[PDB]
From a paper:
The formylpeptide receptors (FPRs) mediate pattern recognition of formylated peptides derived from invading pathogens or mitochondria from dead host cells. With few exceptions, all of them primarily signal through G proteins of the heterotrimeric Gi/o family. We report cryo-EM structures of Gi-coupled FPR1 and FPR2 bound to a formylpeptide and Gi-coupled FPR2 bound to two synthetic peptide and small-molecule agonists. Structural analysis also suggests that diverse FPR agonists sample a conserved activation chamber at the bottom of ligand-binding pockets to activate FPRs.
FPR1 is a high-affinity receptor for many short formylpeptides such as the prototypical formylpeptide fMLF (N-formyl-Met-Leu-Phe), while FPR2 prefers longer peptides or peptides with specific sequences such as the phenol-soluble modulin (PSM) family of formylated peptide toxins produced by Staphylococcus aureus. In the structure of fMLFII-bound FPR1, similar polar interactions among fMLFII and D1063.33, R2015.38, and R2055.42 of FPR1 are also observed. At the mouth of the activation chamber, F2576.51 of FPR2 is replaced by Y2576.51 in FPR1, which forms an additional hydrogen bond with the main-chain carbonyl of fMet1 of fMLFII. The side chain of Leu2 of fMLFII is surrounded by aromatic residues F812.60, F1023.29, V1053.32, and F2917.43 in FPR1 to form extensive hydrophobic interactions, while it only forms hydrophobic interactions with L812.60, V1053.32, and F2927.43 in FPR2 since F1023.29 in FPR1 is replaced by H1023.29 in FPR2. Those additional interactions between fMLFII with FPR1 explain the ~100-fold higher potency of fMLFII in activating FPR1 than does FPR2 as reported in a previous study. Consistently, our mutagenesis data showed that the mutations of Y2576.51 and F1023.29 in FPR1 to their counterparts in FPR2 resulted in reduced potency of fMLF in activating FPR1, indicating lowered potency. In FPR1, our structural analysis suggests that the side chain of R842.63, which corresponds to S842.63 in FPR2, sticks towards the peptide-binding site and contributes to the positive charge potential of the FPR1 ligand-binding pocket. The electrostatic potential-switching mutation R84D reduces the potency of fMLF in activating FPR1, indicating an important role of the positive potential in the recognition of short formylpeptides by FPR1. Compared to them in FPR2, the extracellular loops ECL2 and ECL3 in FPR1 are positioned closer to each other, resulting in a less open extracellular region. The narrow extracellular opening of FPR1 may restrict the access of long formylpeptides, therefore at least partly accounting for the preference of FPR1 against long formylpeptides.
Residue numbers in the entry:
A (entry chain C): 9 to 62
B (entry chain A): 5 to 55, 182 to 233, 241 to 354
C (entry chain B): 5 to 340
D (entry chain R): 21 to 316
E (entry chain L): 1 to 5
Write the structure that this text describes.
């Protein structure tokens, strides 16, 4: 029965968490993807003179 | 083209030759998974073989080297690690015959047997099946009726008929009756009889595997 | 007796809090962005030499070396640029479901049905690789293990417990209890202060490594969770499940943002990894081929076939140059 | 009256060339490149190259029969074609014997095939059929030559001891050399491989019937459809060849015109086995059948 | 194999 009270305590901290709007989180993920897009060899093919796997 | 990494390629080739030699020495050994239903029996058939994690028992019979993976210590979701044993030659499944009265234990053993026999990974893997404690079964069936576990059983409560009925119920759980054969055995105290049965069953499985590979079967 | 209704009320409250914070979906905000959906990756190397199913691979921070584990009992460290095998480590137990390569590169770890995480010292005065410490304290199998540094390794297990270990002492410094089902995967935050563990109970829990209490719990998967990987920010993570669905959970928003599903895909996901920018989600399905999900739009940007059996493990290099997918076919392929 | 026996020969060569090159190619491509190398598949690859190079060599035979024995290609091309044909045919027979012995050893003695039947031993063994094929093809390589004809035609007939130009001695020398080739044909290329195939496919059929391990008759059916096919394709030619090699003196003057067409039609039946080996070893295996459709 | 004559 200790598991039940322990789950109740854990679900208390999950409850009081300073959350942010999903719009802000989505904007942050989109902003990071745009910022690091150039330094990402997978999104845009890299020239063979710069690619170490040939 | 290669200057100081030529020796690196030489090391790569040397350790690849060592990987192949070890791989041949691993494929040489026949791998058996021992998915015992209960601690009972599973321990007994392990002692009857020549000799915390998963116990890997190594033994050799008639120039055939065996590996028995006693995975009973792995009490977790079998679905998430059962695919690790997809290529075992046979699944030695150990059942205690004297578990019908104990508690429903035999019903649990059948549930596990159905779970592994009709598994998506062991469709073509022969299941050796040991029905253990036949001695305790012989004494038990005298006083405790087998109708406790099987209401449908309609036969004289004698060891031969009752044991045959239990073997029939276990052997009837396989929906795939073509790609798999359930080699069943009532365990004899002699260590030689139990190992010989495993050797005979695995030689049959090796012959069938060769037939399937060669295209005959 | 009262605890059960209190827990149900708290679950309703947290669900209401998440619904309140979900002002808009990820798809609505990122509907106007460029659909980067032309992803063709040719296999640039085929690392061969494993004679059994490959269950785990991990890249080095140098993004050149990678350690791969397989059921023939061998950890092989590959110089992926030249396909050479730097080391071949004969494991004590062939049943290895996971492997990790230390960020420093000095050590490798591997564990599985043995319940033990073995730490191997690659750089020794002698020429052989020797096991430094066997971390034996788990009752359930080892599904994942990730090095935090040369001394701290976090290990998810199949007994519902994720553990934090001190390698020199060999004893758990923290046990992350709380999952109700077997934990199948781990993902360390880029800053190494947080790590998300996905379990068979379809719940992914964010944990804090410093004190060891579950910071957040994420649900939304129908079936078992097989793979998890933090977004390069560490403020989001993708999860791979047996229900043929990846989901992107954001840590701050504390709720699922995007669902990565396609009707023709009805097979479980065995591995998940993000691209260097996080714009690509590399999900390794068990339909024998990986997929490339555009993480911001949930449109399948590409496919990485070339593997005969299921893609068991997948990893993107720390510089994002290559994606090494290892499969039960005994062959690791590096893609670019 | 005998013109009919020629068109069937031309078609049997024609069907063998096209079906053989396409089918064996499939075996080489799928087994060699698409599939992993197991002992059984490498044995099939060896048989596939053995009966593929020979079928590729067949157009030379069709044209030679077309021009009444004229070999217009030259000297090197006759040396290479006849050398390749004998290496391959002798191999396309020793490898069938080796596959039969492999299927026999992997059923009669399963413990040995588990412990020692590895790809390493298999590749060591697969040279033995090729090495035997090359050593028994040396009479072709060291004696076969384009020989001029006073009739306005050129022929690929074996020339022995060109050192002795005695018309009488040449016939006497040839009868002897060709008898040796004949005995080696009916005691190494037919009797020994037929004996190995018959003993192997009889012993495995006997075991799988006594053990009762099989459920379907498909193993017995495949063993019969392979052993009988090998016997049906090669028994005609090896039989005619033996009667010819016991009547060679009379054949070297052209007197026995009949064997001339007997050797021709029956040899086409012997060559038919080379095209049907891919039809009968790899495409009756579902693993290969699935792999081929999925390969494209 | 082949009967050249
Ligand atoms: C066509 C004639 C038959 C094929 C040629 C011979 C086949 C090989 C026979 C010997 C195989 C190896 C025997 C020793 C094996 C061992 O080391 O245990
Ligand atoms: C211990 C006694 C063993 C007796 C039988 C040994 C048989 C050896 C010959 C095996 C031939 C086939 C082996 C694989 C070769 C191949 O097919 O490529």
């Amino acid at each position: 029965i200790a598991q039940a009270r322990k789950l109740v305590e854990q679900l208390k901290m999950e409850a009081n968490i300073d959350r942010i709007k999903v719009s802000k989180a989505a904007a942050d993920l989109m902003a990071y993807c745009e910022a690091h897009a150039k330094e990402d060899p997978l999104l845009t093919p890299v020239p063979a003179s710069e690619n170490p796997f040939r | 083209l290669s200057a100081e990494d030529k020796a690196a390629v030489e090391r790569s080739k040397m350790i690849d030759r060592n990987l192949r030699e070890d791989g041949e020495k691993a494929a040489r050994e026949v791998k058996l998974l021992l998915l015992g239903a209960g601690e009972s029996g599973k321990s007994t058939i392990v002692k009857q073989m020549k000799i915390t994690g998963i116990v890997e028992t190594h033994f050799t019979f008639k120039d055939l080297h065996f590996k028995m993976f006693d995975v009973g210590a792995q009490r977790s979701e079998r679905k998430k690690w059962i695919h690790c044993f997809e290529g075992v030659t046979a699944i030695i499944f150990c059942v205690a015959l004297s578990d019908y009265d104990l508690v429903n234990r035999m019903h649990e053993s059948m549930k596990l047997f159905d779970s592994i026999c009709n598994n998506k990974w062991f469709t073509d893997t022969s299941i050796i099946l040991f029905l253990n404690k036949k001695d305790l079964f012989e004494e038990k069936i005298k006083k405790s009726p087998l109708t406790i576990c099987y209401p449908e059983y309609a036969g004289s409560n004698t060891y031969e008929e009752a044991a045959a009925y239990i073997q029939c119920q276990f052997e009837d759980l396989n929906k795939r009756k073509d790609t798999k054969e359930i080699y069943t055995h009532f365990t004899c105290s002699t260590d030689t009889k139990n190992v010989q049965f495993v050797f005979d069953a695995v030689t049959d499985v090796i012959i069938k595997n060769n037939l399937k590979d060669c295209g005959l079967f | 007796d009262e605890l059960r209704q209190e827990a149900e009320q708290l679950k309703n409250q947290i669900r209401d809090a998440r619904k309140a914070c979900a002002d808009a979906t990820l798809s609505q905000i990122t509907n106007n962005i460029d659909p980067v959906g032309r992803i063709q990756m040719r296999t640039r190397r085929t690392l061969r030499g494993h004679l059994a199913k490959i269950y785990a691979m991990h890249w080095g921070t140098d993004s050149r070396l990678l350690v791969s584990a397989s059921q023939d009992g061998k950890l092989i460290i590959w110089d992926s640029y030249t396909t050479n095998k730097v080391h071949a480590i004969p494991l004590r137990s062939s049943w290895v479901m996971t492997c990790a390569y230390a960020p420093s590169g000095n050590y490798v770890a591997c564990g599985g049905l043995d319940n033990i995480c073995s730490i191997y010292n690659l750089k020794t005065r002698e020429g052989n690789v020797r096991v430094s410490r066997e971390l034996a304290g788990h009752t359930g199998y080892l599904s994942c293990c990730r090095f935090l540094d040369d001394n701290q390794i976090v290990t998810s297990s199949g007994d519902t417990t994720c553990a934090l270990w001190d390698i020199e002492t060999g004893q758990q410094t923290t046990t992350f209890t709380g999952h109700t089902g077997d934990v199948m995967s781990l993902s360390l935050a880029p800053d190494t202060r947080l790590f998300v563990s996905g379990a068979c109970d379809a719940s992914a829990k964010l944990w804090d490594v410093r004190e060891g209490m579950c910071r957040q719990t994420f649900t939304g998967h129908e079936s078992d969770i097989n793979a998890i990987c933090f977004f390069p920010n560490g403020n989001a993570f993708a999860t791979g499940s047996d229900d043929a669905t990846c989901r992107l959970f954001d840590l701050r928003a504390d709720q699922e943002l995007m669902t990565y599903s396609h009707d023709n895909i009805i097979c479980g996901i065995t591995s998940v990894s993000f691209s260097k920018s996080g714009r690509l989600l590399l999900a390794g399905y068990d339909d024998f081929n990986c997929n490339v999900w555009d993480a911001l739009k949930a449109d399948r940007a590409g496919v990485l076939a070339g593997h005969d059996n299921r893609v068991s493990c997948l990893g993107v290099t720390d510089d994002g140059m290559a994606v090494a997918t290892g499969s039960w076919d005994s062959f690791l392929k590096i893609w670019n | 009256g005998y013109l009919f026996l020629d068109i069937i020969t031309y078609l049997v060569f024609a069907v063998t060339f096209v079906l053989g090159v396409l089918g064996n190619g499939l075996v080489i491509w799928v087994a060699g490149f698409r599939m992993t190398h197991t002992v059984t598949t490498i044995s099939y690859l060896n048989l596939a190259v053995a009966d593929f190079c020979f079928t590729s060599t067949l157009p030379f035979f069709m044209v030679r029969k077309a021009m009444g024995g004229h070999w217009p290609f030259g000297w090197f091309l006759c040396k290479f074609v006849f050398t390749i044909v004998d290496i391959n045919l002798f191999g396309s027979v020793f490898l069938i014997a080796l596959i039969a012995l492999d299927r026999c050893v992997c059923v009669l003695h399963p413990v040995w095939t588990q412990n020692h039947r590895t790809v390493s031993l298999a590749k060591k063994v697969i040279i033995g059929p090729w090495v035997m094929a090359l050593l028994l093809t040396l009479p072709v390589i060291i004696r076969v030559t384009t020989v001029p004809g006073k009739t306005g035609t050129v022929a690929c007939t074996f020339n022995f001891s060109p050192w002795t130009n005695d018309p009488k001695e040449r016939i006497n020398v040839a009868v002897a050399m060709l008898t040796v080739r004949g005995i080696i044909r009916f005691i190494i290329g037919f009797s020994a491989p037929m004996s190995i195939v018959a003993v192997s496919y009889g012993l495995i059929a006997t075991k799988i019937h006594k053990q009762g391990l099989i459920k379907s008759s498909r193993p017995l059916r495949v063993l019969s459809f392979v052993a009988a096919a090998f016997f049906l394709c090669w028994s005609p030619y090896q039989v005619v060849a033996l009667i010819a090699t016991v009547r060679i003196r009379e054949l070297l003057q052209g007197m026995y015109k009949e064997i001339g067409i007997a050797v021709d039609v029956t040899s086409a039946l012997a060559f038919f086995n080379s095209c049907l080996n891919p039809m009968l070893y790899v495409f009756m295996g579902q693993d290969f059948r699935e792999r081929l459709i999925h390969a494209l | 194999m082949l009967f050249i004559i």
